[PDB]
């Protein structure tokens, strides 16, 4: 049965027929739904059918479905897998696969942009030093002085014989988190472990709240190497508020570039264990999650006290009021610094447009409602009222085990 | 590790495993192929006996008499009743247990810390629409308790072979009329357009205000539904004002005190109670965010933002967020002033986290629908946003049922 998908605000219904193209199981079963879980719990013919399916997707996308080029490409893949157990993508196929992985990413609210992705082929990378150069170019390109551009850099794929290329950091730009044996964390508590790893591999730590981490880059079967990002590469935006002057005094800042660097890109059965990608932020990621999460910088209380709100009682809605102001400060500060950012209303509106384009284009769109609805003001955005079907299509971005 | 769903709280870093899902006898809408967790409504003979046996086992476990002579006698008494009549009947204490358990089992209810404190009115002797009305009036008076709200359910006779059902036609005991206007817009609550027009068709003289309390359409078996007007002093409402924005009172907004769901089917041991209205107290975001701010409900966000002089021409001013917060504060403040029970979403979710811990120990899990439990504003400011949840159907249960018309 294809799911009927209703928008409860508008009363419109669609049917998702794209989900029939899914070949991998998600975590749910008829007995229990595990849709709110963040992470999953856990042969040549199998590779060949994913390869062929991907090759088919590619030629169908260039309208050449059945051309001489198509049949001879399938024959190449076949021959290469039969001989070697693996195969290699053409650059054009890689580009198409990377865009498709993004298009297919159920957790991404920014998929309206899926077609505009700069793909850097870094599969000719042979050392951690080279990965660093490619990463530097990526940041430079993606950052573009604040006029951010979506980009992905694709490092060599996994091979049966060897260790993976990996970037140990979960993002290219992350702030350190220094633990104190009196429990507390200075900086970003989300990055305590990668901070410790960096120090342990010989990084000299700072002691600030916003110390940019170096990269730990690992070439196959080698100790990772440490590479400090040149300060000039890392665009940061100090946070101010358009009307509250004390807000500046908070000393808050955030980096411009959200660049995920720990996910696996799977295309046609091939796996790219290092393929960092970046777009631009949606303000709530910074304002709400990174700054207000209790296990992140956790600044709600501080902002609320400065706003002189009654903090002694939840029913004064001090948290909500402070959150709004902090999100406002992020938007304003990014706008002032001329750095691309999207607010959650604009982003979700674009996502609804994306759902509509995809319905027409493919008969569905995999979407993870818990991730698409923003972390504040949920029902004030259109996506809250929109039913969504979540499923895994390939090419995909997948989580993978931490390399240590 | 353990062969059950692993459930993580990402704020605290703690893990639990849900073993309760093993008790689920009924498939939800998801498959390994695709998750439908976000859909609002996804699509007997020996069957009854098997559900009845299971329910009787639950009752006897809960009174710690499982395996006992009284337990085996009850089982036999149910089999005999079914064998000769096709149906059976619940003892009063079984109904009370079953109603509380249906609440406890309700995955979309964030208010379940209260599940043990539910007043069960047994209205299974009801035999006319007039009497349903008296019972409902009684329920409302009891539950409202002049603003000190008390959870209650009234259970009308179960569905029975051949004979028609008891149905309350209204989706809640208190609802505001929604009047379709000439221009196509709605005065009042757009949610209630259909029930409003049915009330008119069945002889109600409509008002034309934004907050007209609807009459009840009560259906006794095999009879046309009958119309009953709630005496006004029975329906407690709260005019809305804001603690600092003095003009907010001038908007003339109000909401009623008692959220009383009246169109769900209570299913206990295979028996089906098609009329079993239940009521708690509000969580403030239900009023302030959903009922007042949903674009397809009262849709007041823009009016309020304009009074607050916000910049409504750009999303990036966050005018919607600022106005929603102030509306939610007005709801909390106004109910507080009026001394009508209400719980804010921070307090509700904190208590639901406690509920989860309790149920982890009591039963090894708790079915929870994340999308419904996480409040509609400020979601990640609440502890439930960071809590993974496993959603599954247990019985006894409250279930949606089709409209009687
Ligand atoms: C262009 C601007 C973009 C915006 C505004 C955006 C928005 C978002 C947001 C808000 C999330 C949730 C992030 C979180 O909660 O931590 C996300 C997740 C994601 N997006 Fe994007 N996106 C953008 C570009 C991209 C690009 C270029 C890719 C890859 C090519 C991508 C793939 C993903 C993936 C794979 C996830 C899930 C990450 C995870 O599971 O941790 N997005 N997106
Ligand atoms: C005691 C105070 C209570 C609070 C604060 C509360 C809270 C809530 C909230 C916020 C919802 C979501 C409603 C929506 O989005 O429309 C809900 C749903 C629900 N609650 Fe409660 N609850 C309470 C008492 C009760 C009682 C007494 C029962 C039944 C005995 C109940 C059973 C339900 C059910 C079945 C739903 C799902 C309704 C649906 O799907 O439409 N709860 N609860
Ligand atoms: C490309 C892009 C654009 C944009 N606007 N935002 C992003 C952010 C992606 C992201 C960054 N850190 C963390 C996450 C988290 C959950 N918030 C997902 C996650 C979970 C776990 C267990 C590990 C991990 N590395 N990542 C996601 C990426
Ligand atoms: C007992 C109780 C306490 C409390 N605080 N709140 C409630 C509210 C219940 C409720 C009130 N209106 C509407 C709903 C809607 C979805 N928001 C659920 C729903 C959807 C549909 C399609 C049908 C139906 N009967 N019910 C649920 C009930
Ligand atoms: C437990 C829950 O799934 C988890 O907190 C999710 C909820 N929704 C999210 N949505 C986004 N965009 N990012 C997140 O990290 C999360 N976290
Ligand atoms: C599409 C989506 O399931 C729908 O809008 C849900 C989301 N979460 C909800 N949560 C609650 N508590 N109540 C609701 O009516 C809804 N609506
Ligand atoms: Zn699911």
Q: Does B249 share its domain with B306?
A: yes
| DSSP 3-state of A310 | coil
CB A386 within 8 A of CB A31: no
Residue nearest to atom 3 of ligand 4 (CA): B280
From first CA to last CA, the distance across chain A in angstroms is: 43
CB B70 within 8 A of CB B63: no
The count of structural domains within chain B is 3
Angle between helices A91-104 and A44-61 (to 10 degrees): 90
| DSSP 3-state of A210 | coil
Closest-approaching ligand to the CA atom of A40: 3
Question: Does residue A392 form part of some domain?
Answer: no
In Å, what resolution does this model reach?
1.9
CB A119 within 8 A of CB A94: yes
**How many Å apart are CA A381 and CA A374, to the nearest integer?**
8
Q: Does A49 share its domain with A21?
A: yes
A402 Cα: distance to centroid of ligand 5 (angstroms): 19
Report which of B256, B284, B276 is spatially closest to residue B347, judged by C-alpha positions.
B284
A162 Cα: distance to centroid of ligand 5 (angstroms): 34
Ligand 1 pocket, residues with Cβ under 6 angstroms: A 102, 105, 107-110, 113, 117, 150, 152, 260, 263, 277, 279-280, 282, 285, 342, 347, 371, 397
CB A195 within 8 A of CB A185: no
**How many Å apart are CA B366 and CA B105, to the nearest integer?**
8
Sequence length of chain A is: 404
Method used to solve the structure: X-ray
Question: Does residue B219 form part of some domain?
Answer: yes
| DSSP 3-state of A106 | coil
A259-282 burial, b at 16+ Cβ within 10 Å, e below that, comes to bbbbbbbbbbbbbbbbbbbbbbbb
CB contact under 8 A, A292 and B39: no
Q: What is the rounded radius of gyration, in angstroms, for the C-alpha atoms of chain A?
A: 22
Q: Does B67 touch chain A (CB under 8 A)?
A: no
Q: Does A218 share its domain with A288?
A: no
B22 Cα: distance to centroid of ligand 4 (angstroms): 27
CATH code for the domain in which residue A156 is found: 3.90.340.10
CB contact under 8 A, A388 and B38: yes
Residue nearest to atom 20 of ligand 3 (CA): A38
Look up tokens 């004030």; give the residue.
Answer: A380
Under DSSP, the state recorded for A226 is E
CATH code for the domain in which residue B216 is found: 3.90.440.10
Q: Does B289 touch chain A (CB under 8 A)?
A: yes
Q: Does B130 share its domain with B183?
A: yes
* Enclosing domain of residue B102: 18-124+151-161+265-279+349-373
**How many Å apart are CA B98 and CA B93, to the nearest integer?**
8
The answer to whether B286 is a known ligand-binding residue is yes
Q: Does B108 share its domain with B34?
A: yes
Question: Does residue A216 form part of some domain?
Answer: yes
The answer to whether B199 is a known ligand-binding residue is no
Least CB–CB distance from B33: residue in A19, A319, A384: A19
A246's tokens? 């004390």
Determine how many CB atoms are found less than 10 A away from the CB of residue A105.
23
Q: What is the rounded radius of gyration, in angstroms, for the C-alpha atoms of chain B?
A: 22
Report strand pairing: A151-154 vs A277-278: antiparallel
What residues contact residue B278 under an 8 Å CB cut-off, 6+ apart? B99, B103, B118, B151, B152, B153, B154, B260, B261, B264, B266, B398
> Residues A27, A30, A36, A40: what is their CA dihedral angle, to the nearest 10 degrees?
-10
Q: Does B313 share its domain with B190?
A: no
The answer to whether A28 is a known ligand-binding residue is yes
**How many Å apart are CA A310 and CA B95, to the nearest integer?**
45
Report which of B290, B351, B350 is spatially closest to residue B324, judged by C-alpha positions.
B290
B81-117 burial, b at 16+ Cβ within 10 Å, e below that, comes to ebeeeebbebeeebbbbbbbbbbbbbbebbbbbbbee
Give a three-class secondary structure readout of chain B.
Answer: CCCCCEEEECCCCCEEECCHHHHCCECCCCECCEECCCCCCCCCCHHHHHHHHHHHHHHHHHCCCCCCHHHHHHHHHHHHHHHHHCCCCCCHHHHHHHHHHHHHHCCCCCCHHHCCCCEEEECCCCCCHHHHHHHHHHHHHHHHHHHCCCCEEEECCCCCCCCCCCEECCCECCCECEEECCCCCEEECHHHHHHHHHHHHCCCCCCCCCCCECCEEEECCCCCCEEECCCHHHCCEEECCCCCCHHHHHHCCEEECCCEECCCEEEECCEEECCCCEECCEEHHHHHHHHHHCCCCCCCHHHHHHHCCCCCCCHHHCHHHHHHHHHHHHHHHHHHHHCCCEECHHHHHHHHHHHHHHHHHHHCCCECCHHHHCCCCCHHHCHHHHECCEECECCCEEECCCCCC
CB contact under 8 A, A315 and B388: no
Least CB–CB distance from B377: residue in A35, A320, A385: A320
Q: Does A300 touch chain B (CB under 8 A)?
A: yes
| Catalytic (active site) residue A254 | no
């Amino acid at each position: 049965k294809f799911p009927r998908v209703k928008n409860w605000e508008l009363g419109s219904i669609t049917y998702d027929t794209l989900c029939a193209q899914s070949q991998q199981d998600g975590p749910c079963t008829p007995r229990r739904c595990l849709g709110s879980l963040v992470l999953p719990r856990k042969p040549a013919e199998q590779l060949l059918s994913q390869a062929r399916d991907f090759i088919n997707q590619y030629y169908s996308s260039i309208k050449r479905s059945g051309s001489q080029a198509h049949e001879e490409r399938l024959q190449e893949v076949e021959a290469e897998v039969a001989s070697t157990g693996t195969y290699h993508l053409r650059e054009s196929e890689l580009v198409f696969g990377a865009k498709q992985a993004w298009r297919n990413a159920p957790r991404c609210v920014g998929r309206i942009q899926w077609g505009k992705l700069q793909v850097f082929d870094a599969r000719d990378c042979s050392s951690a030093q080279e990965m660093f150069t490619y990463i530097c170019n990526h940041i430079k390109y993606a950052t573009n002085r604040g006029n951010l551009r979506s980009a992905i850099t694709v490092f060599p794929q996994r091979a049966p014989g060897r260790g993976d290329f990996r970037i140990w950091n979960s993002q290219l730009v992350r702030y350190a988190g220094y633990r104190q044996q009196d429990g507390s964390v200075r900086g970003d508590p989300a990055n305590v472990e990668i901070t410790e790893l960096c120090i342990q591999h010989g990084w000299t730590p700072g002691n600030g709240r916003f110390d940019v981490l170096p990269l730990l880059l690992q070439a196959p079967d080698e100790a990772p190497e440490l590479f400090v990002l040149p300060p000039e590469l890392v665009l940061e935006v100090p946070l101010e508020h358009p009307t509250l002057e004390w807000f500046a005094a908070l000393g808050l800042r955030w980096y411009a570039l959200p660049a995920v660097s720990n996910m696996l890109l799977e295309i046609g059965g091939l796996e790219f264990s290092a393929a960092p990608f970046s777009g631009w932020y949606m303000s709530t990621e910074i304002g709400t999650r990174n700054l207000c999460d209790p296990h992140r910088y956790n600044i709600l209380e501080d902002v609320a006290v400065c706003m002189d709100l009654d903090t002694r009682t939840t029913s004064s809605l001090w948290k909500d009021k402070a959150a709004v102001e902090i999100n406002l400060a992020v938007l304003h500060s990014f706008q002032l610094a001329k750095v691309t950012i999207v607010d959650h209303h604009a982003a979700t509106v674009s996502f609804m447009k994306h759902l509509d384009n995809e319905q027409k284009a493919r008969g569905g769109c995999p979407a993870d409602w818990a991730w698409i609805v923003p972390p504040i003001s949920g029902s004030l955005t259109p996506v809250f009222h929109q039913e969504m079907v979540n499923y895994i299509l390939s090419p995909a971005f997948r989580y993978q085990p931490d390399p240590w």
